[PDB]
Design an enzyme around this catalytic site. Sequence first.
Site, PDB file in Angstrom:
ATOM      1  CE1 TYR A   1      55.200  67.155  56.729  1.00  0.00           C
ATOM      2  CE2 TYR A   1      56.079  66.460  54.594  1.00  0.00           C
ATOM      3  CZ  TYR A   1      55.762  66.177  55.914  1.00  0.00           C
ATOM      4  OH  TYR A   1      55.977  64.908  56.404  1.00  0.00           O
TER       5      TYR A   1
ATOM      6  CB  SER B   1      55.800  66.977  61.283  1.00  0.00           C
ATOM      7  OG  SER B   1      56.745  65.961  61.467  1.00  0.00           O
ATOM      8  CE1 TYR B   2      62.027  69.747  55.934  1.00  0.00           C
ATOM      9  CE2 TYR B   2      62.664  67.544  56.673  1.00  0.00           C
ATOM     10  CZ  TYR B   2      62.994  68.743  56.070  1.00  0.00           C
ATOM     11  OH  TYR B   2      64.296  68.923  55.636  1.00  0.00           O
TER      12      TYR B   2
ATOM     13  CG  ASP C   1      54.917  63.731  68.632  1.00  0.00           C
ATOM     14  OD1 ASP C   1      55.100  62.651  68.018  1.00  0.00           O
ATOM     15  OD2 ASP C   1      54.737  64.824  68.052  1.00  0.00           O
TER      16      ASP C   1
ATOM     17  CG  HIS D   1      53.604  63.519  64.853  1.00  0.00           C
ATOM     18  ND1 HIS D   1      54.481  64.539  65.155  1.00  0.00           N
ATOM     19  CD2 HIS D   1      53.600  63.412  63.504  1.00  0.00           C
ATOM     20  CE1 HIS D   1      54.985  65.027  64.037  1.00  0.00           C
ATOM     21  NE2 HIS D   1      54.467  64.361  63.020  1.00  0.00           N
TER      22      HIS D   1
HETATM   23  C1  LIG Z   1      57.074  65.014  60.556  1.00  0.00           C
HETATM   24  N1  LIG Z   1      56.522  64.917  59.337  1.00  0.00           N
HETATM   25  C2  LIG Z   1      58.210  64.055  61.029  1.00  0.00           C
HETATM   26  C3  LIG Z   1      59.489  64.859  61.292  1.00  0.00           C
HETATM   27  C4  LIG Z   1      60.037  65.078  59.888  1.00  0.00           C
HETATM   28  C5  LIG Z   1      59.819  63.711  59.221  1.00  0.00           C
HETATM   29  C6  LIG Z   1      59.434  63.995  57.813  1.00  0.00           C
HETATM   30  C7  LIG Z   1      59.029  64.240  56.708  1.00  0.00           C
HETATM   31  N2  LIG Z   1      58.689  63.125  60.000  1.00  0.00           N
HETATM   32  C8  LIG Z   1      58.137  61.864  59.865  1.00  0.00           C
HETATM   33  O1  LIG Z   1      57.197  61.466  60.529  1.00  0.00           O
HETATM   34  C9  LIG Z   1      58.767  60.885  58.841  1.00  0.00           C
HETATM   35  N3  LIG Z   1      57.902  59.761  58.488  1.00  0.00           N
HETATM   36  C10 LIG Z   1      56.976  59.856  57.327  1.00  0.00           C
HETATM   37  C11 LIG Z   1      57.819  60.079  56.022  1.00  0.00           C
HETATM   38  C12 LIG Z   1      55.922  61.010  57.507  1.00  0.00           C
HETATM   39  C13 LIG Z   1      54.929  61.101  56.350  1.00  0.00           C
HETATM   40  N4  LIG Z   1      54.286  59.761  56.161  1.00  0.00           N
HETATM   41  C14 LIG Z   1      52.889  59.625  56.094  1.00  0.00           C
HETATM   42  C15 LIG Z   1      52.292  58.359  55.909  1.00  0.00           C
HETATM   43  C16 LIG Z   1      50.895  58.232  55.845  1.00  0.00           C
HETATM   44  C17 LIG Z   1      50.326  56.886  55.644  1.00  0.00           C
HETATM   45  O2  LIG Z   1      49.092  56.746  55.592  1.00  0.00           O
HETATM   46  O3  LIG Z   1      51.107  55.909  55.528  1.00  0.00           O
HETATM   47  C18 LIG Z   1      50.076  59.398  55.964  1.00  0.00           C
HETATM   48  C19 LIG Z   1      50.721  60.649  56.142  1.00  0.00           C
HETATM   49  N5  LIG Z   1      52.093  60.759  56.200  1.00  0.00           N
HETATM   50  C20 LIG Z   1      55.216  58.567  56.048  1.00  0.00           C
HETATM   51  C21 LIG Z   1      56.216  58.525  57.217  1.00  0.00           C
END
Ligand SMILES: *C(N)[C@@H]1CC[C@H](C#C)N1C(=O)CNC1(C)CCN(c2cc(C(=O)O)ccn2)CC1
Lengths: 726, 726
Positions: free
Chosen positions: A509, A592-593, A670, A702
Amino acid sequence: SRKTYTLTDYLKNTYRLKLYSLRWISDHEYLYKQENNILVFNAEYGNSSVFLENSTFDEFGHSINDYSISPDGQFILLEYNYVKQWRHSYTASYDIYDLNKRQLITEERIPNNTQWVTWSPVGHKLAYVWNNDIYVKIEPNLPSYRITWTGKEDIIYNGITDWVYEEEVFSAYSALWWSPNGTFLAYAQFNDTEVPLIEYSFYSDESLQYPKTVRVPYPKAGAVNPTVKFFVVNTDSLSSVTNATSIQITAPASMLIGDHYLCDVTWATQERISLQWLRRIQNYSVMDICDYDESSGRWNCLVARQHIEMSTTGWVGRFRPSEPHFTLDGNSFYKIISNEEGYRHICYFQIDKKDCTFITKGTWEVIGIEALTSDYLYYISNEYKGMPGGRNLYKIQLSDYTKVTCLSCELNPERCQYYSVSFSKEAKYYQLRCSGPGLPLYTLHSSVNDKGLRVLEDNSALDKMLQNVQMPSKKLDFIILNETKFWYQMILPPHFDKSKKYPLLLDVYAGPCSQKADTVFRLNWATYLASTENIIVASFDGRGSGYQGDKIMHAINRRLGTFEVEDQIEAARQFSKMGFVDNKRIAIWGWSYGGYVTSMVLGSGSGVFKCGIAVAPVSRWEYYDSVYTERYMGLPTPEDNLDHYRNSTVMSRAENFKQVEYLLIHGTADDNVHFQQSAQISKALVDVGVDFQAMWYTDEDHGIASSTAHQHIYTHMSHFIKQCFS
Amino acid sequence: SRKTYTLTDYLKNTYRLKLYSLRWISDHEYLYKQENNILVFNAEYGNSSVFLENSTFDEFGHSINDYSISPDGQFILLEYNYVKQWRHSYTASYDIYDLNKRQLITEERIPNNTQWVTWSPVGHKLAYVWNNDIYVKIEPNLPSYRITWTGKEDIIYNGITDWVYEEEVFSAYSALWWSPNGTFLAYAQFNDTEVPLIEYSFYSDESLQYPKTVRVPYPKAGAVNPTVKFFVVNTDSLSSVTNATSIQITAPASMLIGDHYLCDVTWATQERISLQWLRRIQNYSVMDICDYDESSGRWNCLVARQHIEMSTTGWVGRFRPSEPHFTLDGNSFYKIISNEEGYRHICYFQIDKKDCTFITKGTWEVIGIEALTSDYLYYISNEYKGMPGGRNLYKIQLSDYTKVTCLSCELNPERCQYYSVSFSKEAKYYQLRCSGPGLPLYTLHSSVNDKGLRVLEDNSALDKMLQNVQMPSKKLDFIILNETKFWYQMILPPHFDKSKKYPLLLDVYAGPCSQKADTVFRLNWATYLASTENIIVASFDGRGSGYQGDKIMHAINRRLGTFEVEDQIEAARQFSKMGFVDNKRIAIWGWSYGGYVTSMVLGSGSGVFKCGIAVAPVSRWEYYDSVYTERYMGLPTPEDNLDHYRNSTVMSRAENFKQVEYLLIHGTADDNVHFQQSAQISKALVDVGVDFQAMWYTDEDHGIASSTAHQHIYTHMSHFIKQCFS
Ligand SMILES: *C(N)[C@@H]1CC[C@H](C#C)N1C(=O)CNC1(C)CCN(c2cc(C(=O)O)ccn2)CC1
């Protein structure tokens, strides 16, 4: 001996984990819903009664996927007709059941397709959003009061977040906050007027002759962001012939100077509310403390009573500034902030004093403040044994900071090293949730003496089933990279023989502030790869990782796609140097990341990795949303950080893929990471003459989480890995 | 021996075929371009001179991708700034060059983004379309005359076809027809006002932040079609101030009663034009012959001169009613129509007489009428040796239909069995083009005696190269199914040994009126498969096939996806019974209709095929365009043929894919067979739990012909086949 944990066990979920989800309704009772009837439990002795029978709604004529009992114990909000939208948002139908007369209120009911609904903190008041407008219902059966009239689809959002605020700043659909006793209702308004829209196709069921185009307001890095406005309305001074009056709280001036965000609202007292603002350049944030003016009606935020939080090494907060916890009189509060040494600890503030006082310190961090009593402050931290991947509950005495006690550390050190907590309303009782390294364990306690009351669920059933299966083991250790230590974990196959050379899959990740190496017990795809395919699955937390101080986390500031991928490569290189790894068979994958990092590593030309799988990856930061990207990358302008935005794309490393086997996967619908990102990756690989494998998932987003797509993607990936390693 | 025909040979086109593309400018001369300069030849003697030197445009400053000399010899149209659209359509810039004074015209030039341009048939007049409106230039340097004012993007088309008319009826972008000596300019107007739009994403270059949505008026089966209007203008009766008047030619009533199409326009004489109209139910077509009225200025189409063409077994024509060939006086004409026995032959008509007289007959078909003099009628047919896959030129005496002579049969029976011809202006001379089964051979002849004047190109150079490489051989033969014989061809590996068992790949198309078994020489992917990989590449023409009479062709009327796919299975089942086929390694692949059939065959559950490749396939007919789809399937309503529309989808057979290895490929910018079709196929397979391989090509259309994409897809497919067979 017996069998192993197969791919089918994982896909069909044959080995199920038991949970214990309770909903505290007071400082003494919680509701333990079951597959049928909801029970009410007495925390002290444990006795229980039935709150409402499963049969109570046999003839509701609709499937109920969720209930929400009023803080009154008088009403039950019934949610049905659920229709998911993004990660948090969704629409549904709601019916209110009167627990008193056991009658189903049929008058002035909540509209269908309602976006959000929530009870007041105390009474049985209702506030909901519909057609992007806010409505208040003082009584379940009474007519509603329209609070706002500007609501407009995809343009003006009242009481709800737009796409980017839901995902990146509030992790919620709702943008409304009741005051402690319900007198006031604070809300936010978002304007998506000039926000560009992402457009993509949705093919729907086979019967659709023409594919539809889904368009949604989504700001990519450097684009026009939505604007926000904060308001407060008095829910008692609302007539029924006059339009409610909402008082706007604006500024601060250090924010209004340019693009900014609203990243937090927290009520201090019944007439005091705190708001945190963040500049578009998430380097600087400002907390305003505003007080209600009885003989004026409006709110005043005294400058001098505000607090600045900024960083010169990176951005502010882990993802956003932390939330404050106000003392009874609301004249002081506790909140997590970065040390002078770069470690996040609890700082104690006086609302009108600039310098706060750290009540904790050390080379470890506070994960979060869980409860605040006038006596103690309960928080979670990774201090124990100096393991950043562990979580424990601690309580510190507000009268003597020197008196901090660990409430979870020794309960069961072998089985439990990762805890989460859930206190009752007044923190009289608390439920501890252990999620590893052993089987999840749920227990109940009492705050006065911190006495263990009882085991709520120990997953003994799963324990019995698993003793007849060859399960993998987990190694959690660390390596050293020039002075600093970086942690990693390895899911090791059963009967691990360090003398033998195993193929290895790097599970990645690695996004800023992430953590893949921990003590959590999991039953996932990696369990199967290790148990059945005898593949070691490792994860490494390198530069950029969180929970270890800013020197490490802020190391990739303005430099996404550099150190965090290089470190993943260095881990692999060192894993192979441990002696039980066949360096001719090392693979990497992520989502994703993790998909981004995987692709960057595979296009690095390191030659370390034979193959890799990227699922829904970012290919270039100008394609991703502003709030998240800009937090780390700054602005994509030649005056700011454009050059690096252009140097860290996957497509520029296309030529290097000639050396590896690549599997590119992506859902067509997505909304987060647009198909577009992979479309451009595959295009650059084609233009360079690199053969690879791909798979699209039509109408999947996604998560690629529908039952069928989920089983299909992991089945496809298993084949790919098996073929790459065998 | 030496080497083989490799994949790189195919992709890098190392073994180039030579052509002799000439353009007849008179009855005695033709123009022959070279990579450099254009020469002019004297058909009689062969002596040539330079028409215009290559250097002439060294400093033009623009890459010219196409020239167009006026039938005047006086001017040269220069095409540059070329931008492709659909199969035939494209926009470009045009500059005129005055060969008389050797000057480049700079005044009143053709606008940029011109959609189409054409010289008059005799002088140097020009008609062009820009922004969907028609313009006329009596002189290259003079101001242009606007002819139409209704042009509106994606709505009203003047002089050019809309999407479906370009692809399915005219096979051209152009929708304007000059009268013989250039006096009149006839054109069609298309209205797509209520035609639904197909929408899809176009990613473009990496630099594009937000993907774009392409939307084109495209009517799917049963949807609202575009309507058509026809006009004729006298380009000699134009002021320069008066908005020239276009005279409309409407009806016929039997056509206006409901949805219809304009399927053909042919000028008979300087003042007589013929139009062919077809009902949306392509069962009935009416031809009108209209005459210019001197003291009226209008055009009258005398009922009595109109001829009806209809069918009870299927649709009219191969792909549309055949075109008429008028005798000099325009008082009679010849055209290919279906026999009473179901075979297509030349019928002779008196413009004012209902019944015609067939001048040819037999169990073979006339492919086309190529020329007409006062003495003879020349035509191509597959009569010789009774093999449907051969083509030869014939000439028939108008005085005695009994006297038909074959002009190509014996020229070289071993090397030449597939001819095409190009006559000079008054048919005094003609060029024959042998395209197989041996190397292509181009020769010149004089009509008076049919004497060969000389050989234009014999590909001796290519012949020399090919002797140092192990080329595959081609077997053209047939089999017999219930009385009827069906032809097939097989590309055999070098040193083929009927004793050995080879893997077999069935290359399929099978669309109505198709032909995959012929005597044409080809250097393609199959050449590589056989030569280098030693795979037999076969093709079979079953029910629905063309050029063998209607009984066979109309077998699948209103029933696509039935006998034509079943027969392809029978053929394989029949091939695997010849002894030189490893029945454990039979694959199948196709593009477009072939993709559809391959998918239906793989979902048949026959057990005969191990793997298959479907490229840009149709999955269910309601997704494809109306003109082509309804021609064989009728309308998708419960009152017509809806039940079969729902019974011939690929997704209904998803389950059966469990027994095969499938590769689904599709360009994302496919405006013809929309990605949606493969997107629904993949979804059905996922939802049923079937594993398969996929691969999208971003921004590629139906041909996936870009240099890089082309190389990439064949490389990918080669790996797949190799893996399936090794
Ligand atoms: C993939 N992970 C995408 C592209 C890269 C960037 C990062 C890291 N992405 C996001 O979607 C960014 N947004 C967050 C930071 C992803 C992880 N996240 C989250 C929240 C929950 C929840 O229950 O609130 C669960 C799993 N992941 C918060 C938003």
